[PDB]
Amino acid sequence: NTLLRKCSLNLVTVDVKPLLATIKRFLTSNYDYLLDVVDKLVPMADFDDVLEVYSAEDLVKALRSEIDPLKVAACRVIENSQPKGLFATSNIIDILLDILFDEKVENDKLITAIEKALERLSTDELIRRRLFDNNLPYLVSVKGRMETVSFVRLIDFLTIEFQFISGPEFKDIIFCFTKEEILKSVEDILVFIELVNYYTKFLLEIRNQDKYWALRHVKKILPVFAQLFEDTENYPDVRAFSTNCLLQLFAEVSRIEEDEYSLFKTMDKDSLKIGSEAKLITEWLELINPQYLVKYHKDVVENYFHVSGYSIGMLRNLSADEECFNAIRNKFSAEIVLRLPYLEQMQVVETLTRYEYTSKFLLNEMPKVMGSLIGDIIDLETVHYRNSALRNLLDKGEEKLSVWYEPLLREYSKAVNG
Amino acid sequence: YVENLLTQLENELNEDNLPEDINTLLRKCSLNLVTVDVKPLLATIKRFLTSNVSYDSLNYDYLLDVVDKLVPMADFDDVLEVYSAEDLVKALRSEIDPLKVAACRVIENSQPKGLFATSNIIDILLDILFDEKVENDKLITAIEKALERLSTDELIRRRLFDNNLPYLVSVKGRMETVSFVRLIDFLTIEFQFISGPEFKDIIFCFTKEEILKSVEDILVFIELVNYYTKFLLEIRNQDKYWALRHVKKILPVFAQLFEDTENYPDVRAFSTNCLLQLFAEVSRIEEDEYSLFKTMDKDSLKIGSEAKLITEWLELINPQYLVKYHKDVVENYFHVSGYSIGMLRNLSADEECFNAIRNKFSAEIVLRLPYLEQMQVVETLTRYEYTSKFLLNEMPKVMGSLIGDGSAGAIIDLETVHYRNSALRNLLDKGEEKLSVWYEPLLREYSKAVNG
């Protein structure tokens, strides 16, 4: 029906019980379009009206049914629960998990509807309790199975759920993997990669939400990933298929909140050996905490890095620590920068405008580069980096910029005001 | 592995009959390309898609999903040998939707992005995009994705807004609901990439008469309101203030429509919240000084004269504007509660406007709030120098509730922990010199909260 498209559009841009009841009837005995109407319609109705048409027991039957579109509908109703904890007393959540981790289930729209119902509702404490207490043994069982399809879904679910989990609710047995589970995961490299990425995101989220309490629970197995990475003899698939993901993990581990890098420096000494493998050095110097790198590998920083377009990734990392920048300072001269093409110049300059210490270096030692930034431009990239550089300098105020203030203010104005 | 997976797929696709396996194999291929000589397989898949015979047992969505994941990985030179610019034209001109989606994935991943800007390929994409008979939302999405990706490039943008300008302007003039919405989404995407010199009023901007025309189908009007709100938002997020001169003159028209409830009842009935979001952006435009917004307010919006809108206005409108032109409303209307936290977050973001609501605070009123609401209020007061100073010097008892009684590690409520920790962090950032005796306790509680 073109009517169905019309309804959907008219609902996205802008007594429902008969229509809802009628769709319910039709679903129990083109569907993508009918479901889109339910999807756009339920959220705007009054949930008590929806609940007249779909009771808790109707939802159970619909989910236990064999009609997928009816399940998707039920997902939409559950997702817009008011209050979010409404269904947390029943086995409805349980049944959603039974479908979600069922590998015979191949309907991606159904899977996605469930994942969204759960993500929305999981801000509520009672829903999290039904998930992580009432269904703990199911979750743990699916975790232990490590069956590829459901396991990838479990990882996706745990990544979403950890966003909402407080210290007191955090359970090891569900969010953390032991050394032996990681060793087992290497047998199917796709699962292993999924696990590497899970931990990289876990560490990222720990930094971004300041959940440092969760580190005690993760730190002990991080060395296992480094060990696997080193041991190309016994686990050649690790370096063969997961080098890049592991690099991103190790980048996070080098930034963890710990005492003089004790964890990361022992992973480096024992397993990673930064500097010893030529083909990896640019990536290490692009990715690893630059304070770590200058404290333990000043040697590599001083001899490996030289200014060019190629080395821009390294420069953005290495210059984000003051001591690390001082170890590459003697590779800069105005003359070296000015021979770069303008785009690459604006990338270098933009990086140097990010910190007080790189900025002072640019202004006091490379005034000619300042001259090339001020200038006498189609590229979207070049304009982005230039204007970013201009803005970053102006945030220093008139005092620090000395004579460069007014010429910067006029170039920024030109670029921004036309 | 995955090389094994594909070569098995290539082999099974080429069997005289399709194995019963095929859809399961495809499903596994895409799931594995996600996590981690591609031409033969890409050509084989192409043969099925261009073929004059359909296969009953083959899942074309699964086939397409394998192409979707596989094209971006290949060397686009290898892709191009299977799908030439002439193949792409013929694919887009076909009647076979799945082959069109495939074409769109190839185009989307063009390297260099400008490769196809010399053909009429872009033109045909627009011809499909704005054809209201086209109902396949999958194809519409594929096209928009191809266009967003390639539009970083100067040559793609010229093919679009030079080679096809009259057609685009004709679509703008239809104002036919379905193609119109696609046009608005298209212009929103494109504005992200467009420079001052590339900017053409004729296609990115609407006249007073067009806006009045749009009211006839309140749905179109609403798209247009939202278009302009995102337009102004993008102006501020990307600092493209040069665009303002092109947009300023029609903004009072939205305000005139908002006021004229008798002649345009649909406007207030269906688009009030959308319009309020628009006026919020107008109150923040780079101009001197509230010249345009002041006039819209005096003539049309009349902030304060319609009581049921006052919360919305004080939640949304530039706080400096509010305190300068409606100080009386601010001083009288606002009081502390859970309900007014929206107003507080907005009125607090200007120092003078904050001074007009300061006398509504007392330790006593804040401490009768539930802890979640307390933490929301306190977190807001920690966002600014003038508000934090007020909190430290005038409401120590509130600071005392923030520090708390030792039970804060028991808190599982998502928001409470989020706002408490933000408040703690925000005060600590002020530095030990501005926190006085609060520094040590703040540091202690912060450490406990994030390490325990």
PDB file of C-alpha atoms in Angstrom, chain B residues 104-310:
ATOM      1  CA  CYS B 104      25.010   2.500  -5.754  1.00  0.00           C
ATOM      2  CA  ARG B 105      27.534   0.617  -3.525  1.00  0.00           C
ATOM      3  CA  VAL B 106      30.132   0.680  -6.319  1.00  0.00           C
ATOM      4  CA  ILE B 107      29.609   4.427  -6.920  1.00  0.00           C
ATOM      5  CA  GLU B 108      29.569   5.171  -3.188  1.00  0.00           C
ATOM      6  CA  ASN B 109      33.117   3.750  -2.837  1.00  0.00           C
ATOM      7  CA  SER B 110      34.621   5.486  -5.885  1.00  0.00           C
ATOM      8  CA  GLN B 111      38.351   6.190  -5.705  1.00  0.00           C
ATOM      9  CA  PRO B 112      39.165   8.820  -6.499  1.00  0.00           C
ATOM     10  CA  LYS B 113      35.788  10.152  -5.318  1.00  0.00           C
ATOM     11  CA  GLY B 114      35.739  12.348  -8.433  1.00  0.00           C
ATOM     12  CA  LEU B 115      36.093   9.434 -10.863  1.00  0.00           C
ATOM     13  CA  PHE B 116      32.480   9.432 -12.126  1.00  0.00           C
ATOM     14  CA  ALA B 117      31.898  13.219 -12.076  1.00  0.00           C
ATOM     15  CA  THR B 118      32.443  13.293 -15.862  1.00  0.00           C
ATOM     16  CA  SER B 119      29.611  10.842 -16.652  1.00  0.00           C
ATOM     17  CA  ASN B 120      25.874  11.327 -16.427  1.00  0.00           C
ATOM     18  CA  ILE B 121      25.922   8.802 -13.519  1.00  0.00           C
ATOM     19  CA  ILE B 122      25.293  11.476 -10.839  1.00  0.00           C
ATOM     20  CA  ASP B 123      22.425  12.842 -13.019  1.00  0.00           C
ATOM     21  CA  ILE B 124      20.711   9.458 -13.146  1.00  0.00           C
ATOM     22  CA  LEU B 125      21.096   9.028  -9.367  1.00  0.00           C
ATOM     23  CA  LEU B 126      19.174  12.354  -8.962  1.00  0.00           C
ATOM     24  CA  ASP B 127      16.614  11.230 -11.508  1.00  0.00           C
ATOM     25  CA  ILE B 128      15.918   8.188  -9.329  1.00  0.00           C
ATOM     26  CA  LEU B 129      16.237   9.985  -6.005  1.00  0.00           C
ATOM     27  CA  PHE B 130      13.504  12.521  -6.781  1.00  0.00           C
ATOM     28  CA  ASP B 131      11.114  10.155  -8.623  1.00  0.00           C
ATOM     29  CA  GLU B 132       8.133   9.828  -6.251  1.00  0.00           C
ATOM     30  CA  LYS B 133       7.073   6.547  -7.835  1.00  0.00           C
ATOM     31  CA  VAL B 134      10.284   5.056  -6.420  1.00  0.00           C
ATOM     32  CA  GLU B 135       9.189   3.454  -3.182  1.00  0.00           C
ATOM     33  CA  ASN B 136      12.139   1.235  -2.428  1.00  0.00           C
ATOM     34  CA  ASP B 137      13.512   2.903   0.687  1.00  0.00           C
ATOM     35  CA  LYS B 138      16.569   0.638   0.396  1.00  0.00           C
ATOM     36  CA  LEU B 139      17.469   2.189  -2.971  1.00  0.00           C
ATOM     37  CA  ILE B 140      16.697   5.709  -1.729  1.00  0.00           C
ATOM     38  CA  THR B 141      19.057   5.120   1.181  1.00  0.00           C
ATOM     39  CA  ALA B 142      21.783   3.635  -1.031  1.00  0.00           C
ATOM     40  CA  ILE B 143      21.675   6.738  -3.235  1.00  0.00           C
ATOM     41  CA  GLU B 144      21.811   9.161  -0.328  1.00  0.00           C
ATOM     42  CA  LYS B 145      24.774   7.188   1.086  1.00  0.00           C
ATOM     43  CA  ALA B 146      26.534   7.275  -2.266  1.00  0.00           C
ATOM     44  CA  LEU B 147      25.939  11.021  -2.507  1.00  0.00           C
ATOM     45  CA  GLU B 148      27.004  11.870   1.055  1.00  0.00           C
ATOM     46  CA  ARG B 149      30.269   9.946   0.661  1.00  0.00           C
ATOM     47  CA  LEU B 150      31.230  11.396  -2.714  1.00  0.00           C
ATOM     48  CA  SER B 151      30.204  14.973  -1.979  1.00  0.00           C
ATOM     49  CA  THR B 152      33.378  15.712  -0.035  1.00  0.00           C
ATOM     50  CA  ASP B 153      34.808  16.091  -3.545  1.00  0.00           C
ATOM     51  CA  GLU B 154      34.658  19.346  -5.541  1.00  0.00           C
ATOM     52  CA  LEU B 155      33.907  17.700  -8.851  1.00  0.00           C
ATOM     53  CA  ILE B 156      30.918  15.708  -7.524  1.00  0.00           C
ATOM     54  CA  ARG B 157      29.464  18.942  -6.083  1.00  0.00           C
ATOM     55  CA  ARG B 158      29.750  20.725  -9.469  1.00  0.00           C
ATOM     56  CA  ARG B 159      28.076  17.880 -11.336  1.00  0.00           C
ATOM     57  CA  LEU B 160      25.280  18.266  -8.722  1.00  0.00           C
ATOM     58  CA  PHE B 161      24.743  22.014  -8.366  1.00  0.00           C
ATOM     59  CA  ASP B 162      25.967  23.080 -11.847  1.00  0.00           C
ATOM     60  CA  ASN B 163      25.081  20.288 -14.292  1.00  0.00           C
ATOM     61  CA  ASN B 164      21.762  19.546 -12.567  1.00  0.00           C
ATOM     62  CA  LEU B 165      20.742  22.914 -11.112  1.00  0.00           C
ATOM     63  CA  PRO B 166      17.593  23.453 -13.184  1.00  0.00           C
ATOM     64  CA  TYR B 167      16.253  19.990 -12.420  1.00  0.00           C
ATOM     65  CA  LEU B 168      16.940  20.413  -8.673  1.00  0.00           C
ATOM     66  CA  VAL B 169      15.174  23.780  -8.740  1.00  0.00           C
ATOM     67  CA  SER B 170      12.282  22.178 -10.550  1.00  0.00           C
ATOM     68  CA  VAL B 171      12.024  19.548  -7.754  1.00  0.00           C
ATOM     69  CA  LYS B 172      12.079  22.375  -5.196  1.00  0.00           C
ATOM     70  CA  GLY B 173       9.174  23.990  -7.055  1.00  0.00           C
ATOM     71  CA  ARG B 174       6.992  20.871  -7.243  1.00  0.00           C
ATOM     72  CA  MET B 175       6.832  20.735  -3.497  1.00  0.00           C
ATOM     73  CA  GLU B 176       5.472  17.249  -3.964  1.00  0.00           C
ATOM     74  CA  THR B 177       5.605  15.737  -0.526  1.00  0.00           C
ATOM     75  CA  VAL B 178       7.702  12.627  -1.192  1.00  0.00           C
ATOM     76  CA  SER B 179      10.305  14.072  -3.523  1.00  0.00           C
ATOM     77  CA  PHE B 180      10.337  17.250  -1.429  1.00  0.00           C
ATOM     78  CA  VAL B 181      11.409  15.469   1.748  1.00  0.00           C
ATOM     79  CA  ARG B 182      14.177  13.702  -0.171  1.00  0.00           C
ATOM     80  CA  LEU B 183      15.249  17.125  -1.514  1.00  0.00           C
ATOM     81  CA  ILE B 184      15.412  18.617   2.012  1.00  0.00           C
ATOM     82  CA  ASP B 185      17.484  15.659   3.259  1.00  0.00           C
ATOM     83  CA  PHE B 186      19.695  16.061   0.211  1.00  0.00           C
ATOM     84  CA  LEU B 187      20.232  19.810   0.876  1.00  0.00           C
ATOM     85  CA  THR B 188      20.981  19.129   4.551  1.00  0.00           C
ATOM     86  CA  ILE B 189      23.639  16.606   3.595  1.00  0.00           C
ATOM     87  CA  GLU B 190      25.121  18.909   0.934  1.00  0.00           C
ATOM     88  CA  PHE B 191      25.279  22.044   3.095  1.00  0.00           C
ATOM     89  CA  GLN B 192      27.912  20.252   5.205  1.00  0.00           C
ATOM     90  CA  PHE B 193      30.310  20.291   2.268  1.00  0.00           C
ATOM     91  CA  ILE B 194      29.502  23.547   0.525  1.00  0.00           C
ATOM     92  CA  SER B 195      31.788  26.592   0.500  1.00  0.00           C
ATOM     93  CA  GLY B 196      30.739  30.213   0.315  1.00  0.00           C
ATOM     94  CA  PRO B 197      31.657  30.459  -3.401  1.00  0.00           C
ATOM     95  CA  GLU B 198      29.766  27.273  -4.238  1.00  0.00           C
ATOM     96  CA  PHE B 199      26.635  28.468  -2.391  1.00  0.00           C
ATOM     97  CA  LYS B 200      23.516  29.050  -4.507  1.00  0.00           C
ATOM     98  CA  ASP B 201      20.506  30.742  -2.911  1.00  0.00           C
ATOM     99  CA  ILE B 202      18.239  29.470  -5.628  1.00  0.00           C
ATOM    100  CA  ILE B 203      18.437  25.889  -4.423  1.00  0.00           C
ATOM    101  CA  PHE B 204      19.383  26.159  -0.699  1.00  0.00           C
ATOM    102  CA  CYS B 205      17.029  29.007   0.206  1.00  0.00           C
ATOM    103  CA  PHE B 206      13.269  29.503   0.194  1.00  0.00           C
ATOM    104  CA  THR B 207      11.385  32.743  -0.477  1.00  0.00           C
ATOM    105  CA  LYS B 208       8.554  34.065   1.656  1.00  0.00           C
ATOM    106  CA  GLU B 209       6.137  32.872  -1.007  1.00  0.00           C
ATOM    107  CA  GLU B 210       7.537  29.330  -1.015  1.00  0.00           C
ATOM    108  CA  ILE B 211       7.222  29.162   2.778  1.00  0.00           C
ATOM    109  CA  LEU B 212       3.620  30.402   2.606  1.00  0.00           C
ATOM    110  CA  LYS B 213       2.954  27.883  -0.172  1.00  0.00           C
ATOM    111  CA  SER B 214       4.264  25.105   2.078  1.00  0.00           C
ATOM    112  CA  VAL B 215       1.681  25.707   4.780  1.00  0.00           C
ATOM    113  CA  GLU B 216      -0.949  24.145   2.492  1.00  0.00           C
ATOM    114  CA  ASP B 217       0.574  20.734   3.359  1.00  0.00           C
ATOM    115  CA  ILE B 218       1.581  21.158   6.997  1.00  0.00           C
ATOM    116  CA  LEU B 219       3.938  18.171   6.556  1.00  0.00           C
ATOM    117  CA  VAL B 220       6.029  20.063   3.965  1.00  0.00           C
ATOM    118  CA  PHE B 221       6.009  23.189   6.166  1.00  0.00           C
ATOM    119  CA  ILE B 222       7.303  21.159   9.108  1.00  0.00           C
ATOM    120  CA  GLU B 223      10.150  19.730   6.974  1.00  0.00           C
ATOM    121  CA  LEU B 224      10.988  23.275   6.029  1.00  0.00           C
ATOM    122  CA  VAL B 225      10.987  24.463   9.666  1.00  0.00           C
ATOM    123  CA  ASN B 226      13.305  21.619  10.611  1.00  0.00           C
ATOM    124  CA  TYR B 227      15.445  22.266   7.494  1.00  0.00           C
ATOM    125  CA  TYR B 228      16.028  25.812   8.687  1.00  0.00           C
ATOM    126  CA  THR B 229      16.697  24.740  12.271  1.00  0.00           C
ATOM    127  CA  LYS B 230      19.386  22.279  11.159  1.00  0.00           C
ATOM    128  CA  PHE B 231      20.637  24.946   8.706  1.00  0.00           C
ATOM    129  CA  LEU B 232      21.246  27.411  11.539  1.00  0.00           C
ATOM    130  CA  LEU B 233      22.609  24.654  13.783  1.00  0.00           C
ATOM    131  CA  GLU B 234      25.160  23.716  11.106  1.00  0.00           C
ATOM    132  CA  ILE B 235      26.017  27.371  10.616  1.00  0.00           C
ATOM    133  CA  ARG B 236      27.091  27.494  14.312  1.00  0.00           C
ATOM    134  CA  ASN B 237      28.744  24.039  14.427  1.00  0.00           C
ATOM    135  CA  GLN B 238      30.840  24.569  11.280  1.00  0.00           C
ATOM    136  CA  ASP B 239      31.282  28.363  11.656  1.00  0.00           C
ATOM    137  CA  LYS B 240      29.766  29.203   8.260  1.00  0.00           C
ATOM    138  CA  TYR B 241      28.483  32.578   9.344  1.00  0.00           C
ATOM    139  CA  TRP B 242      28.709  33.778   5.712  1.00  0.00           C
ATOM    140  CA  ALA B 243      25.578  31.733   5.096  1.00  0.00           C
ATOM    141  CA  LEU B 244      23.589  33.874   7.582  1.00  0.00           C
ATOM    142  CA  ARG B 245      23.115  36.799   5.164  1.00  0.00           C
ATOM    143  CA  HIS B 246      21.383  34.365   2.790  1.00  0.00           C
ATOM    144  CA  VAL B 247      18.885  33.160   5.420  1.00  0.00           C
ATOM    145  CA  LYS B 248      18.169  36.104   7.769  1.00  0.00           C
ATOM    146  CA  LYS B 249      15.447  37.732   5.687  1.00  0.00           C
ATOM    147  CA  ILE B 250      12.874  34.951   5.673  1.00  0.00           C
ATOM    148  CA  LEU B 251      13.063  34.095   9.411  1.00  0.00           C
ATOM    149  CA  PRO B 252      10.406  36.637  10.481  1.00  0.00           C
ATOM    150  CA  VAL B 253       8.036  34.776   8.119  1.00  0.00           C
ATOM    151  CA  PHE B 254       8.114  31.657  10.351  1.00  0.00           C
ATOM    152  CA  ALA B 255       7.420  33.994  13.296  1.00  0.00           C
ATOM    153  CA  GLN B 256       4.490  35.667  11.491  1.00  0.00           C
ATOM    154  CA  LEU B 257       3.001  32.229  10.793  1.00  0.00           C
ATOM    155  CA  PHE B 258       3.485  31.216  14.438  1.00  0.00           C
ATOM    156  CA  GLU B 259       1.470  34.257  15.640  1.00  0.00           C
ATOM    157  CA  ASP B 260      -1.375  34.025  13.075  1.00  0.00           C
ATOM    158  CA  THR B 261      -3.363  31.259  14.693  1.00  0.00           C
ATOM    159  CA  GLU B 262      -6.699  32.214  13.126  1.00  0.00           C
ATOM    160  CA  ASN B 263      -5.638  32.233   9.490  1.00  0.00           C
ATOM    161  CA  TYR B 264      -3.089  29.412   9.819  1.00  0.00           C
ATOM    162  CA  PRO B 265      -4.468  27.162  12.558  1.00  0.00           C
ATOM    163  CA  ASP B 266      -2.428  24.185  11.312  1.00  0.00           C
ATOM    164  CA  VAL B 267       0.817  26.002  12.154  1.00  0.00           C
ATOM    165  CA  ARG B 268       0.249  26.241  15.918  1.00  0.00           C
ATOM    166  CA  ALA B 269      -1.690  22.932  15.957  1.00  0.00           C
ATOM    167  CA  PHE B 270       1.010  20.714  14.404  1.00  0.00           C
ATOM    168  CA  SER B 271       4.359  22.531  14.346  1.00  0.00           C
ATOM    169  CA  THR B 272       4.639  24.461  17.625  1.00  0.00           C
ATOM    170  CA  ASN B 273       7.585  22.509  19.065  1.00  0.00           C
ATOM    171  CA  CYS B 274       9.466  22.527  15.762  1.00  0.00           C
ATOM    172  CA  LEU B 275       8.998  26.282  15.498  1.00  0.00           C
ATOM    173  CA  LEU B 276      10.210  26.788  19.058  1.00  0.00           C
ATOM    174  CA  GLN B 277      13.389  24.877  18.227  1.00  0.00           C
ATOM    175  CA  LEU B 278      13.785  27.176  15.189  1.00  0.00           C
ATOM    176  CA  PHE B 279      13.385  30.322  17.325  1.00  0.00           C
ATOM    177  CA  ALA B 280      15.914  29.005  19.790  1.00  0.00           C
ATOM    178  CA  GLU B 281      18.519  28.945  16.978  1.00  0.00           C
ATOM    179  CA  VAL B 282      17.434  32.380  15.691  1.00  0.00           C
ATOM    180  CA  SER B 283      18.013  33.836  19.215  1.00  0.00           C
ATOM    181  CA  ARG B 284      21.625  32.589  18.978  1.00  0.00           C
ATOM    182  CA  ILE B 285      22.611  33.689  15.453  1.00  0.00           C
ATOM    183  CA  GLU B 286      25.737  35.769  14.844  1.00  0.00           C
ATOM    184  CA  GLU B 287      24.136  39.252  14.569  1.00  0.00           C
ATOM    185  CA  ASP B 288      24.285  42.578  16.418  1.00  0.00           C
ATOM    186  CA  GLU B 289      22.371  42.805  18.580  1.00  0.00           C
ATOM    187  CA  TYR B 290      19.285  40.604  18.665  1.00  0.00           C
ATOM    188  CA  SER B 291      18.273  42.990  15.909  1.00  0.00           C
ATOM    189  CA  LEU B 292      16.311  40.399  13.927  1.00  0.00           C
ATOM    190  CA  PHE B 293      15.146  38.242  16.879  1.00  0.00           C
ATOM    191  CA  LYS B 294      14.107  41.322  18.894  1.00  0.00           C
ATOM    192  CA  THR B 295      11.896  42.366  15.982  1.00  0.00           C
ATOM    193  CA  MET B 296      10.360  38.902  15.527  1.00  0.00           C
ATOM    194  CA  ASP B 297       9.675  38.893  19.259  1.00  0.00           C
ATOM    195  CA  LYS B 298       8.079  42.375  19.322  1.00  0.00           C
ATOM    196  CA  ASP B 299       6.003  41.747  16.202  1.00  0.00           C
ATOM    197  CA  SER B 300       5.092  38.078  16.518  1.00  0.00           C
ATOM    198  CA  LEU B 301       6.473  35.830  19.249  1.00  0.00           C
ATOM    199  CA  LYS B 302       5.617  38.147  22.164  1.00  0.00           C
ATOM    200  CA  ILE B 303       7.453  36.102  24.796  1.00  0.00           C
ATOM    201  CA  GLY B 304       5.627  36.321  28.100  1.00  0.00           C
ATOM    202  CA  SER B 305       2.182  37.171  26.709  1.00  0.00           C
ATOM    203  CA  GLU B 306       1.130  33.577  26.261  1.00  0.00           C
ATOM    204  CA  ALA B 307       1.410  31.926  29.684  1.00  0.00           C
ATOM    205  CA  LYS B 308       1.340  28.289  28.539  1.00  0.00           C
ATOM    206  CA  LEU B 309       4.525  28.854  26.487  1.00  0.00           C
ATOM    207  CA  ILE B 310       6.632  30.589  29.105  1.00  0.00           C
TER     208      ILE B 310
END
